[PDB]
Amino acid sequence: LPSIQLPVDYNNLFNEITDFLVTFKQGPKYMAMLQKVANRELNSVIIDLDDILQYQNEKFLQGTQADDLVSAIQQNANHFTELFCRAIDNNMPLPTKEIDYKDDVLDVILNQRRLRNERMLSELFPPNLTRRYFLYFKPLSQNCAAISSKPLSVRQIKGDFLGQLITVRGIITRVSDVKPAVEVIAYTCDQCGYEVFQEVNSRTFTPLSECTSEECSQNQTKGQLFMSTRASKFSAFQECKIQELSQQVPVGHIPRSLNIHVNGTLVRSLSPGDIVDVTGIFLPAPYTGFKALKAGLLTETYLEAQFVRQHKKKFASFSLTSDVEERVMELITSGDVYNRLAKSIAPEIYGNLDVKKALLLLLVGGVDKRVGDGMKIRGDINVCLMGDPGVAKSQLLKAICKISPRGVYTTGKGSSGVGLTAAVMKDPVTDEMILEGGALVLADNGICCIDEFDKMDESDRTAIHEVMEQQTISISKAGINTTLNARTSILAAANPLYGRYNPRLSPLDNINLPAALLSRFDILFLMLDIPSRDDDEKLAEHVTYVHMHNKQPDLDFTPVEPSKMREYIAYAKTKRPVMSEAVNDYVVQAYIRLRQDSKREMDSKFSFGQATPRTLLGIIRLSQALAKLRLADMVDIDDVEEALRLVRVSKESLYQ
């Protein structure tokens, strides 16, 4: 009933929008996109607010006043999706190329309807019915920066923000599968042969049932309406949920969450377990009909997604733009990348260089193989660290957990073999049975870190056997019978029996693992804490420096930063280097010697069990990883001898 004044007039802002779309350039930037839309080449338009800020600054420096459109579309974001769409529809250019127009049902229907009106004469339909494109806003760069550039945790999203454009940081908990949602519905009248349309915005609607057209009415033609899919307009819909990071929850509270909606080409971007910076519009969800009359003033709410930024680029997302090319050329031209990359893993830890080199080869991994008859062979590498207390095992393990784009960390005592693999939970109130994957599934195509491996129960450790070699999980339980994919490499850490390693016994007595499991690790590294006045002094001088400066001590060596390291590793995981006959003869001859030496010494104090055929393929996998890191397309004997050295060094700790 009443009315107020406000500082904003939308006519001025509409004029600014139509100038911006036809003038801005880094021809003008957005007219190329609209030409691609007109050619049917492109389905969505992404508006950059950095452009609008730049445009405002340039117009100001030319000595003229202008409205602050950037804050104006952040404060009340919902309304401007319509203004930009009307401007785009007004200014859309004509096609540059032939289209085959007859493929469109709506074109035929509207052409015939226009012809009917033309004959009869001897808005027509809602404009939403012919918008072939989607439109989204991208928030301000924080380095140019405003609230949309600054991430909020899910607790900080108060009721003040309803209507605004914001950014949210958290973990995704669940994702729905895609289904269609109506936008414009189409009907046919039987007796008078005429078509009518209806537009849907709310969660529910009543379909039409009477032909209220004036011509039909004046012919007293009370015809029947029928619905049609073939000329209705749908859009893809998906719903998700986001939840705050566990390390940001205040003490004694339960974590909170938000509902996310996604439409258009942005669909199936999110996935469960992702850590992500989502940005969008935060809105209420009104009730409808009789429910609204007795629901009260408490409103449900949700987030309309507009753009999504991931924290770590998955290795599958790689493509060699020249921006990346220029950076990998730095490492390639500098040379000796193997040592530099290994030295760059956890620089705050002194020494341990061979362990770091082994863990770099774990990050790269071997080549997947699939024979013409259907047999397949594991490409992943498995590694284990066995050693005394206080030698940085947990610390080094947790450092590698940062580099990998997909990975999880777990400890032996806190873990169930079920929850480690996959569980059949009677989760809903409806008594339904549903399968939910465990840690080894969440680490699919990544690394799984298992600390305190010696504390985990002997029965529960057997769950890992199938995943380690076959990279799959098989379940046959109440109402569920399926196989899941688990393409994951395992890294584990343990103390020997009795804690500190005991020289009175053999290595196998100290290790205390069964034969079938000890074989599934490609490398097991044995590391012992033996005092030395000389080495202890150097280690202490290094650690004390680190505590003093927060920096590793350096005179010669500069580590590569983790980002450039990820780019190099991601580029290196694409190569698939092949073997050759000269190399094959050498490794074939090496394998015989290993088994003969094992047979000779099964009695001996220097025994470590017997070399199985899985030790041959371990050599091939390590060799191929080394070939990948030098960006080759061919394994070289130089790789094989290093792969043998790296296996030999694991046992030298036994000899003080």
Binding site: N78, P284, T410, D536, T544, M548
Partner: protein
């Protein structure tokens, strides 16, 4: 109607007379106006109910007996005062029509209206009351609509409307249907302007009488409270709290036609006006405290004074007292630029004969640390001590609850092997991680551990190895910074001294009591708590080359020289030296660690480790 204006005038006279409230309005406004140009303070003021009594008794009793007729005009007058004071020009679209007035809160002298949930009675309805109890439940936060704004497409005019519900206002009005208008009076189609509309936060809680007051094992009684705007989420379950607000009734009570024959009663609530906690830990320093703390720190031997003032009722064990003081101060926690973490908190273990004050000394820490949890070793399971699953929801254990605090474990030797191994992560990585059916999560647990145990043979046997006397694995003993062995060696003068000491202790009488009625210098514990709090918040000592020169030499000699030492020596021993030196420098309020601190830390570690100084 006319009476509303006069009440606004009379409260304006009060606000002009008692000027300390104008300063409050103005200071909040200028603070908010400053940082807006770069957190924000709420538009709320607390008035002393005594000032209002001395100013006008007729207004005082009106606020206190008829709040629905006196609180609204008073609050209106406060908003006019804040609005007439100068404010930033050219407000934005949302600021122009925020629908956000200032709000009141009260303190002091409620008299007869200070109550508890058991005694709140139908006579007190519509009065302003104060209640005390324990929070038991809290709802989720929800937004609530109060105003909406609409733009008319053809005419270019902005329209608006307001909404009400029975819990939003002290006075009573016709309820509103929560519908959005789609069309103008003149037939123009409307659009809704989110971001210009106004929504507020809402939360319901429940408060119950304290269990100490429950009669005869009878059922306890409780009330529901309504909170909104600024008051949301300032409490959690288990809090002891005192709430101020108006006590009111709701609904039709079955007189709107029902099957009950109207035997059922009306519903009732308290509308939260102000909330205060109860202490049942933290203290806030006055200026004089800063002066005294800084002056005392320049004595020659502050460490001796402070350490001997811990548990003066316990004779002897000087070194354990010094170790506990350094534990309460702690080291400095490091986070490196690559995300790597280096531990800061000190863990202590003590093992010894029966009756040698182990449990009695362990009990003292629980009553001087700001956050402390206590448990017996056999009364706790691995999951209960770290974390457990429920319904999926994950529930914290004792080590997760004391995050930045200390945890005390008595009868540590009785804990089973299956329970002990759950602790190996928490004492170094300072986290808890679970991987069970339907759950994977990491939790933080940053505390310091102090614990007591009995040796294997019931008394310590010097004629057998320390490993034979102490049945724990080497990987666990390595995680304790200081390991103390203590025994009851029989000697004449020692026995005489201790016995005379406990007899002098048992002859104490508290100050306010006649004899037989039932109930160097030492700083008082209430001052020592302030000293520890100040030192832990305001000083962060950085390491120096002179300290490092001592630390490196001591570590390499101690590790390499062959001796009958009672604990394994590893890379973690070096960190114990750095932590102890940093904590001693912090006692001294020094901005940097010096050679003296490193020397003292070495002389404490040598005593505990090699048994002799």
């Amino acid at each position: 109607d006319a009476v509303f204006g006069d009440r606004v005038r009379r409260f304006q006279e009060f606000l002009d007379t008692f000027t300390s409230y104008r300063d409050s309005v103005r200071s909040i406004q200028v603070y908010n106006s400053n940082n807006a140009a770069n957190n924000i303070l709420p538009h709320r003021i607390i008035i002393s109910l005594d000032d209002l009594r001395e100013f006008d008794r007729s207004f005082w009793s009106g606020i206190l007996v008829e709040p629905a007729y006196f609180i609204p005009p008073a609050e209106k007058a406060l908003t006019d005062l804040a609005d007439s004071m100068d404010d930033v020009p050219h407000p934005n679209a949302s600021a122009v029509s925020s629908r956000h007035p200032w709000k009141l809160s009260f303190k002091g002298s409620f008299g007869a209206h200070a109550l508890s949930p058991r005694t709140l009675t139908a006579q007190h309805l519509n009065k302003l009351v104060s209640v005390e109890g324990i929070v038991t439940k809290t709802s989720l936060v929800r937004p609530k609509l109060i105003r909406s704004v609409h733009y008319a497409a053809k005419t270019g005019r902005f329209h608006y409307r307001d909404y009400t519900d029975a819990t939003t206002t002290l006075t009573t009005r016709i309820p509103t249907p929560a519908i959005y208008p789609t069309e103008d009076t003149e037939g123009n189609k409307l659009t809704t302007e989110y971001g210009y509309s106004t929504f507020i936060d809402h939360q319901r809680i429940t408060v119950q009488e304290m269990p100490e007051m429950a009669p005869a094992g009878q059922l306890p009684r409780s009330i529901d409270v309504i909170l909104d705007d600024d008051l949301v989420d300032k409490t959690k379950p288990g809090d002891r709290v005192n709430v101020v607000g108006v006590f009111k009734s709701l609904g039709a009570g079955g007189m709107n036609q029902s099957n009950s024959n109207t035997l059922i009663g009306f519903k009732t609530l308290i509308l939260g006006n102000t909330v205060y906690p109860l202490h049942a830990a933290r203290q806030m320093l006055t200026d004089f405290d800063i002066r005294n703390i800084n002056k005392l720190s320049k004595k020659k031997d502050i460490f001796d004074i402070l350490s001997q003032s811990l548990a003066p009722s316990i004779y002897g064990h000087d070194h354990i007292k010094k170790a506990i003081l350094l534990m309460l101060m702690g080291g400095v926690e490091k986070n490196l630029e690559n995300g790597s973490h280096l531990r800061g908190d000190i863990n202590i273990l003590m093992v010894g004969d029966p009756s040698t004050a182990k449990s009695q000394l362990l009990r003292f820490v629980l009553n001087t640390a700001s956050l402390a949890i206590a448990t017996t070793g056999r009364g706790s399971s691995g999951v209960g001590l770290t974390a457990a699953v429920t319904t999926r929801r994950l529930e914290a254990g004792a080590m997760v609850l004391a995050d930045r605090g200390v945890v005390c474990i008595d009868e540590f030797d009785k804990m089973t092997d299956v329970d002990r191994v759950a602790i190996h992560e928490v004492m170094e990585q300072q986290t808890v991680t679970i991987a069970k059916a339907g759950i994977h999560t990491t939790l933080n647990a940053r505390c310091s551990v102090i614990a007591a145990a009995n040796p294997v043979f019931g008394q310590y046997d010097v004629n057998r190895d320390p490993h034979q006397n102490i049945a724990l694995p080497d990987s666990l003993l390595s995680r304790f910074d200081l390991l103390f062995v203590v025994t009851d060696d029989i000697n004449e003068i020692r026995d005489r001294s201790i016995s005379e000491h406990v007899l002098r202790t048992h002859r104490y009488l508290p100050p306010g009591y006649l004899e037989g009625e039932p109930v160097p210098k030492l700083v008082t514990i209430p001052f020592l708590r302030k000293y520890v709090q100040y030192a832990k918040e305001r000083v962060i000592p950085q390491l120096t080359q002179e300290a490092i020169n001592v630390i490196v030499k001591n570590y390499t000699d101690l590790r390499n020289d062959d001796n009958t030492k009672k604990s394994p020596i590893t890379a973690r021993t070096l960190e114990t030296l750095i932590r102890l030196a940093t904590a001693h420098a912090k006692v001294r309020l020094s901005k940097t660690v010096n050679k003296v601190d490193a020397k003292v830390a070495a002389n404490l570690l040598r005593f505990a480790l090699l048994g002799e100084d």
